[PDB]
């Protein structure tokens, strides 16, 4: 009696906040603020998929440490904290709610784009084979460039992470924000602690499974100390191999986080699927099941899906809502678009990233032959 | 240090449900349903204004005997419940958060528009002086036609009343409404057993506070043992005499209602102010004040309320949300409007009610130079 047969457009209760569909944003870079701050360009493209079941913002650099791609936003500054404000205020004038997605990408980055040349910080000193970042060269130029190789963090020199990361929960809830979300995918930096094949540290945060989740569990209790775990949100991608990070236990440690969060109560377990419509490895059968009877709390997956696929995770009760990413960009309105089958805007890859409106602003909500924008 | 600073666009917890912004949809009869069941046209026009931190529908007829206006909405048969679910589906695709209003005319009706020319009912066999409804008549035309005597509604008879309201709740919650609210203000039915001047019963329904509230609190009853009472409002005016309705003891009941409806844990009540910019009296000086104590759950207040006014009662700590009605009408994006202090489309009362779409779903969207309907 518990399990209903929930809709793409049925109000779900997602920790103490309540959504009013399972249409969620996926958080994406988009680089549209040349200094890291949010303008009105950010209040206009947010608040144009406010109808989003859940908005999760693009991945913000909780200091100058953990940014990797230039024209990021921030959360570590009162102009910044104050630029979202604003932007945290349109989305809800429009009746979305918005999560910050707390970033740090570690060993994916380059002493250009660190600040004052700083080299890039990881659990191990692994450099991130092929992987590269965001640079603006000194000539003004910006584009791909090859990560450098990182130092391994000092013993001493996590809690100083930890505390970032709660200084930017603080700056986010003082800025209006519905939700945190720890980015702990996509092999970020705290990714980089939990993979095997980037975590090889010796003291208390390595070796084992309980010692790579230390790292982030400590981000994620310092973040819901200021949210309350109830507002609390991570994002995980327990057998993806991204930027050269490998793994041998993906899923003794998927069990154990969600066996911690659980406890914990955090609102959800954000996955972003290794799926690949065009190659990668898959989930291991009966993985969607195990997080589902491991994690009580909210589950939403995210990777190439549509709305049928959507409803069928749904209809599996194997998670409770499903993000969009490229069909949220090209598409403001997507759980309309759903509602009614309509057909969908063709995303453009090449304005995903940098830029100003174009690619980013201007792409057409649907016309029901009502709407007017005298 | 509970009382922070909200402001028109600081989320709100409703009860178990979680709001956007505090700029409320108010309920409000358009009679755009030929037949009392909703179609597209409501699912466009409800959808348009999606954005409200929550949006209470329009008056809805639990009954064909509850019916004193032609072409509103009904609630007590599958086409209109079906009906309704489409709306409701239209709104949570938007973002937006939808509260059905149970609607009871009472003795505010007439033989042509009630059901198989039967007399309408009331607590008393008062006639409503001067009062009008709207009504069809023979020759297929409509318009505003005296409201006839009621007859006295039997002891007996009431608990079937109750059953109505409580059917009617049933197919809401089928029909995914967030929200319902008990309609019980401006001289209808549940208001007509509350007022002195309307109640002249002498059986347990009548004759003192906790009789003319015995009614009323059992329809809120009813209603709130299926949506609980978490999600459950009511729609109250104390010091309003309309529809020839008078009262001796509007403080005492507002108080009364106020001490039964926090025990019951309502989710909210819904004050529309006997004020008006021409006329009427006014609230007795710290009746606000009064009511914020003897209630802890949301206050709303309606009632030629801007942007100015609305959140000077959020300062003073007497109101969590404010809802509007006419600039909702004319505005579909009125808390954007109110964000950016932007001017306002200016109503038009010629077509507030019947008709089609113009006057319905014809009213602009502000045109920020970015979004596109293509
Ligand atoms: C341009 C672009 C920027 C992205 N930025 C982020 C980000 O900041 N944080 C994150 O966790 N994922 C990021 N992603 C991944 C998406 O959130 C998402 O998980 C992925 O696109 C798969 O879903 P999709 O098929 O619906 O797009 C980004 C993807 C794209 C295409
Ligand atoms: C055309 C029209 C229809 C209305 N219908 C309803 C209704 O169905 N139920 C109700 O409780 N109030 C109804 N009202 C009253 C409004 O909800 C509101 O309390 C009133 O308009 C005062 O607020 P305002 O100054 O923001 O319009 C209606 C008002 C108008 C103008």
């Given at each position: 009696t518990?399990?209903?047969?929930?809709?793409?457009?049925?109000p779900l209760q997602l920790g103490s906040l309540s959504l009013p569909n399972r249409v969620i944003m996926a958080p994406l870079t988009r680089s549209r603020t040349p200094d890291s701050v949010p303008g009105r360009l950010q209040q206009i493209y947010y608040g144009q998929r406010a109808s989003a079941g859940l908005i999760i913002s693009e991945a913000t650099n909780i200091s100058p440490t953990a940014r990797g791609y230039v024209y990021t936003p921030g959360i570590w500054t009162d102009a910044q904290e104050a630029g979202w404000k604003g932007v945290v205020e349109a989305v809800h004038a429009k009746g979305g709610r918005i999560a910050l997605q707390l970033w740090h990408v570690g060993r994916v980055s380059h002493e250009l784009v660190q600040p004052d040349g700083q080299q890039p910080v990881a659990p191990s000193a692994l450099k991130?084979?092929?992987?590269e970042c965001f640079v603006e060269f000194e000539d003004g130029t910006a584009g791909l460039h090859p990560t450098s190789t990182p130092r391994a963090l000092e013993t001493d020199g996590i809690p100083g992470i930890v505390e970032d990361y709660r200084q930017a929960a603080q700056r986010a809830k003082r800025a209006g924000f519905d939700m945190v979300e720890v980015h702990a995918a996509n092999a970020c930096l705290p990714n980089q602690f939990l993979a095997t094949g980037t975590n090889r540290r010796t003291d208390q945060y390595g070796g084992s499974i309980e010692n790579r989740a230390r790292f982030p569990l400590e981000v994620v209790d310092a973040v819901a100390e200021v949210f309350g775990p109830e507002?609390?949100?991570?994002?995980?991608?327990?057998?993806?191999?991204?930027?050269?990070?490998?793994?041998?236990?993906?899923?003794?440690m998927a069990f154990y986080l969600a066996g911690e969060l659980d406890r914990r109560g955090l609102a959800y377990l954000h996955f972003?699927?290794?799926?690949?419509?065009?190659?990668d490895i898959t989930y291991p059968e009966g993985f969607r099941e195990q997080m589902r009877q491991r994690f009580k709390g909210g589950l939403i997956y995210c990777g190439n899906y549509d709305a049928g696929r959507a409803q069928a995770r749904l209809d599996d009760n194997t998670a409770d809502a499903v993000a969009f990413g490229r069909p949220f960009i090209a598409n403001p309105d997507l759980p309309e678009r759903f509602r009614l089958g309509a057909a969908l805007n063709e995303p453009d890859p090449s304005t995903f990233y940098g830029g100003a409106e174009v690619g980013y602003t201007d792409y057409p909500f649907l016309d029901?032959?009502?709407?007017?924008?005298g």
């Open positions: 518990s399990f209903s047969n929930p809709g793409l457009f049925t991130a084979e092929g992987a507002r609390v949100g991570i994002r995980l991608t327990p057998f993806l191999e991204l930027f050269g990070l490998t793994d041998d236990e993906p899923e003794a972003n699927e290794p799926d690949w419509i065009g190659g029901n032959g009502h709407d007017r924008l």
